[PDB]
Ligand binder design. Structure first.
Ligand SMILES: Nc1ncnc2c1ncn2[C@@H]1O[C@H](COP(=O)(O)OP(=O)(O)CP(=O)(O)O)[C@@H](O)[C@H]1O
Ligand SMILES: Nc1ncnc2c1ncn2[C@@H]1O[C@H](COP(=O)(O)OP(=O)(O)CP(=O)(O)O)[C@@H](O)[C@H]1O
Ligand SMILES: [K+]
Ligand SMILES: [Mg+2]
Ligand SMILES: [Mg+2]
Lengths: 131, 215, 211
């Protein structure tokens, strides 16, 4: 069973993501947060296998949280709606294992979690310098 | 001489350059709003509908609850996009102007107007009445006149909005062209009820003058 | 001083004026977003409303609808992704690539080394600088007869400073601000920036904007 922490500031989306992932047989949402600090605190203390992280959250961003968790054995997957410039370079430098789109089908998110747990790096083509 | 004309130009050329920068500054402010507004609500619509599909047989009740919020979310997203113009200031008449340009072009009738000289600050009711009358005046040009040109003027004079619709065709009506249940009398009755007026001149083609109080 | 009161009056007039172009811009943006998305969102709504009505009656059709609801959302979001990306203008990193291509195509040596790159500049000020950088280099290509062009882009104190230097010969009159030079100065000054020129050993433009 894969243990997941979800950091997402928009409660509606946070709740929908948790619901979408708890549907999987081999996955479990062990905690939910709305800030980057919530992610740093839970991951350092509870040590889940995976951390699903939004970028822009109040206080500390998911990119800032990812930088603080760079050395911890947790596998971080970034989730964004848009690709603002330099998000990709900052993400890879922080050692994010996944950088996906929030609205990518749920099947693809569960697939990225399994791939990341298998030591793979999953980056949405859309979120890297495209076309 | 007309060296001043070259200077007057020099100025509006500059003014318009500064206008394009305050326009760009707005475009940017709007993208940030959209980025949150639409971006997020569409991201949510996606996930919530994806989950709704996964619960159709599992929990049909939750699938329904999700769909209720997907409809709610979509309905507001659209109304947030209507709200990025927090004025409604002279907008129905501006939309009717687009409709009549399309209708006249489709009919091979030259449309003569001045988009910049159009009033705002009219009541939404009186604006909607004028839109209706403008539509009818132009429907009449297309159906009856056999005009090659149609000229629309919209002027805010004192406390009336005056619209004139002129065409260079030939008037086809009888001595008294105001008949029960049809456009000319219909426009007059609706305008008069709003304490406005409708006048017609059928000498050199047909010209309708419609006026309504500001409010 | 009564001068403070006058500046109030000048600021109000400039804001009153600005608001008429802003209100016009909004009116335009709105009509066009409602064009490309106003049906798609209305469709998502109906299709999801119907899928809810079929959940128990025809769960198969509810699924089919949902597949569609889902598809029209993904593409709408993708459209938006494009629209916002477009509304944000020429990024300075992208303009730098354009000027390298233009100078190379013109057989002019391009000299640039990244130093003190701006960490955060407003999208507006970035777009203004992109426009000025493009023009400075268009002028080098069209008029200078230079063999070399040196561009420096640095965050110095509370400004972003861009210098465009060339080793050609300046072709303008004593007062060359009539067009691009006056255009750049006016656009920079509107942004509380500045444009200076040195035409001794070729032509050197120094442009600064707050940041
Ligand atoms: N622009 C125009 N040029 C020439 N004749 C016109 C005209 N507008 C109106 N007329 C004439 O006056 C008549 C009366 O117009 P009116 O608007 O009352 O009814 P109508 O024929 O347009 C049917 P309805 O408006 O209900 O669709 C028309 O049938 C036509 O003969
Ligand atoms: N880098 C450069 N090298 C040589 N001459 C230059 C130059 N930049 C500008 N000039 C001179 O200054 C004049 C004014 O420049 P400016 O950019 O304002 O107008 P222009 O002649 O390029 C028309 P526009 O800029 O609108 O395309 C040019 O006509 C040219 O003589
Ligand atoms: K589970
Ligand atoms: Mg009629
Ligand atoms: Mg020029």
């Amino acid at each position: 069973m894969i243990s997941i922490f979800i950091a997402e500031d928009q409660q509606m989306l946070l709740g929908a993501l948790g619901s979408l992932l708890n549907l999987e047989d081999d996955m479990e949402v062990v905690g939910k947060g709305t800030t980057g600090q919530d992610a740093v605190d839970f991951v350092k203390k509870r040590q889940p296998d995976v951390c699903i992280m939004d970028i822009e959250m109040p206080g500390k961003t998911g990119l800032e949280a990812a930088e603080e968790l760079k050395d911890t054995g947790c596998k971080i997957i970034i989730l964004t709606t848009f690709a603002r410039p330099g998000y990709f370079q900052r993400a890879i430098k922080a050692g994010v294992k996944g950088y996906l789109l929030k609205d990518s089908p749920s099947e693809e998110l569960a697939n990225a979690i399994r791939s990341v747990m298998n030591g793979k790096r999953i980056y949405a083509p859309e979120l890297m310098e495209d076309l | 001489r007309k060296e001043r004309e070259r200077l007057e130009e020099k100025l509006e050329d500059a003014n318009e350059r500064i206008a394009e920068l305050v326009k760009l500054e707005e475009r940017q402010r709007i993208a940030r709003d959209l980025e949150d507004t639409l971006g997020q609500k569409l991201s949510l619509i996606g996930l919530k509908s994806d989950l709704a599909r996964k619960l159709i047989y599992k929990d049909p009740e939750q699938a329904a609850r999700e769909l209720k919020s997907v409809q709610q979310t979509a309905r507001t997203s659209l109304n947030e996009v209507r709200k990025i113009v927090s004025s409604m200031k002279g907008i129905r008449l501006k939309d009717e102007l687009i409709n009549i340009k399309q209708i006249l072009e489709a009919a091979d009738i030259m449309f003569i107007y001045e988009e910049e000289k159009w009033p705002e600050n009219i009541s939404l009711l009186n604006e909607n009445i004028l839109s209706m009358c403008l539509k009818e005046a132009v429907t009449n040009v297309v159906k009856h006149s056999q005009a090659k040109t149609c000229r629309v003027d919209i002027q805010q004079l004192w406390k009336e909005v005056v619209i004139t619709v002129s065409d260079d065709g030939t008037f086809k009506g009888e001595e008294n062209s105001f008949s029960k249940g049809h456009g000319l009398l219909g426009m007059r009755e609706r305008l008069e009820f709003a304490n406005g007026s409708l006048h017609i001149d059928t000498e050199n083609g047909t010209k309708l003058t419609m006026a309504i109080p500001n409010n």
